[PDB]
Chains A and B, each alone.
Chain A
């Protein structure tokens, strides 16, 4: 009824006793949380010591009580101190409480560090334990087979690498139409949300590359990349793919959108360039 008998065990010394005492609390740690909040410093001391095999447990009690109090900020330190037993949370609607705050924290923290230096994924600026918990949510979204989730979360926290793995696995041309549609959602998304200049640029040039790899794709979607970033080199590249096809009418359609859309100074470069590669005068 009262967990005060179990509290009594914490304060009592002998390791073999404490060993029992953490396991007792842990059974009823999810189920009781205002009968045990007075001995949270004793518990934190056990985690701080490394004469326990029970450091992982100790830290887990501490965290479960602390979110229920309101202290999601304190709680999460203890999350990554426990280092295991959040496998359950993911498959539990019931608790995914300690997961929520970890992902949130990651997005605020990592966006600060992207501006400073792009890399932080393999450097020590964001810890490898902070990183690995983030990537666990990507694994759950591709399990659940909705890719618009994983492309969104990665764009929040300023991750280039996740985008690169996520799009590589969708690519297999399981449907031609669906690869492209996925790509158009990331495009619309990046335009609007992302206010970091470098990051929006990286992801838009990247989408041109992915689209182009397919041999069956819309070239109207490929053309959207061109105009947004406004690069002549991209435009050169696109028609060189249709030099290889040797399809003028194809090229003529792409050009009509592009001549309308594109900045005139960009376009002046583009023709001179395509004259230098040699081309048929109708496209020019």
Chain B
């Protein structure tokens, strides 16, 4: 219990809101990123009608696979913003 616990300033972090310049900035960055590697994704699923799994990964990519990289980033920012609205709506009702 001694190691895991981080005082009464542990719960404190979980009701704090942040500058919205950095939040709006976080959103745009991720958004823009998924346009760019999603042109890579377009190339990939235009083709992929040809046999040999390894050959697909050299030619149209499958090493640092575009579908995979997009999906992780999309999920990450989606989870943040579910939090950002939850933590905000909590404070609005809770404190007032």
Query: Do A and B touch (CB < 8 Å)?
Result: no
Chain A interface (Cβ within 8 Å of chain B)? none
